[PDB]
From a paper:
Bromodomains (BRDs) are protein interaction modules that specifically recognize ε-N-lysine acetylation motifs, a key event in the reading process of epigenetic marks. The 61 BRDs in the human genome cluster into eight families based on structure/sequence similarity. Despite large sequence variations, all BRD modules share a conserved fold that comprises a left-handed bundle of four α helices (αZ, αA, αB, αC), linked by loop regions of variable length (ZA and BC loops), which line the Kac binding site and determine binding specificity. The four helices form a deep cavity that is extended by the two loop regions (ZA and BC loops), creating a largely hydrophobic Kac binding pocket.
BRDs are evolutionarily conserved and present in diverse nuclear proteins comprising HATs (GCN5, PCAF), ATP-dependent chromatin-remodeling complexes (BAZ1B), helicases (SMARCA), methyltransferases (MLL, ASH1L), transcriptional coactivators (TRIM/TIF1, TAFs) transcriptional mediators (TAF1), nuclear-scaffolding proteins (PB1), and the BET family (Muller et al., 2011).
Author numbering: 727 to 837
Write the structure that this text describes.
Amino acid sequence: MEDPDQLYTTLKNLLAQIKSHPSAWPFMEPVKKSEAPDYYEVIRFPIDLKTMTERLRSRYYVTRKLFVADLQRVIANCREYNPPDSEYCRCASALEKFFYFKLKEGGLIDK
């Protein structure tokens, strides 16, 4: 981005699609402590799709890499905190596969 608008609309279109995928459900909002009470001690950079939407809209994502780092961390955080064949991790693999196909579709990583 010396074309910030192209980046913005590309990311917004990407994220709208990611949030539409059925495996995005566990990652739609920040982890509640009433469910995972040590989460925010164990996971020091928590990330979710609501926070990512707020970051997009406030122009946090000035590079594609900042967006991809946060998206990839939604998955890495899941795999660090949850059992590898838990439902949550099942979803994480499904959503990751889907967003890599999208990243590749949008020319955002190599195909």
